């Protein structure tokens, strides 16, 4: 029974330790990727119209 309670505790600990940080990291990566994509698109548009003019 000691080890069964330890199983439950380590399940919850692994959740709080790696499962949620993984989701937070995924959200951070996708947010930063969105920012970088918008920045690159705007810079490319600026360069293209520079070349056109």
């Amino acid at each position: 029974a000691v080890e069964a309670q330890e199983i439950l505790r380590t399940d919850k600990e692994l959740i709080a330790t790696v499962r949620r940080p993984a989701e937070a990291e995924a959200h951070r990566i996708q947010q930063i990727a969105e920012g970088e994509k918008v920045k690159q698109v705007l810079l490319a548009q600026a360069e293209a119209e520079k070349i056109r003019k």
Partner: protein, 52 residues
């Protein structure tokens, strides 16, 4: 990758339009060169030969 592809597409389209712009300008430019050259006599050809 989508951002890079859009960048390449837009920059290439802009530079191609610029190439077309100089193309039209140079064509309308050379038409008058030919028109002017049409009115050249022996004196003008002699001047060109002695300049070259």
């Amino acid at each position: 990758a989508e951002a890079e592809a859009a960048s390449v597409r837009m920059r290439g389209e802009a530079e191609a339009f610029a190439i077309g712009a100089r193309a039209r300008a140079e064509a309308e430019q050379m038409a008058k060169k030919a028109e002017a050259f049409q009115l050249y006599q022996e004196a003008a050809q002699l001047d060109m030969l002695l300049e070259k």
